[PDB]
Amino acid sequence: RTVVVTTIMESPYVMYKKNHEMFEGNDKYEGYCVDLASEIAKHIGIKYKIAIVPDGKYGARDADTKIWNGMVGELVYGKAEIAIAPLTITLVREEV
């Protein structure tokens, strides 16, 4: 199975290549986290697809609705298999 990776467009971690209109799939993107994802996949033995989180957020729990947004939410609610991004380890995220 193809592993679904959630990430976020922020330089220099993940950036769309200048010529991305001529490219397909993962090769549309470049950056530190793109290179890291490739190294992790090679060491762990999986194929993967880079997807960009829809709401453009890292991950916080709404005070009113208690719903997690961002990349954290994509993992919590079962929509993605892994997040490879500039995502800070914090107490409230480690809890979920």
Partner: protein, 41 residues
């Protein structure tokens, strides 16, 4: 690197990060994107 509670993927993902660190690959990637591709010398 984050994942889904209890996900089996998280135990090989973590070992890979520790290995890439010890091999100097994470330092190589930071240098590539910040300094080799930097514009200010």
């Amino acid at each position: 690197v984050a994942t889904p509670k209890g996900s089996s993927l998280r135990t090989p993902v973590n070992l890979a990060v520790l290995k890439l660190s010890e091999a100097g690959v994470l330092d190589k990637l930071k240098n590539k994107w910040w300094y080799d591709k930097g514009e200010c010398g």
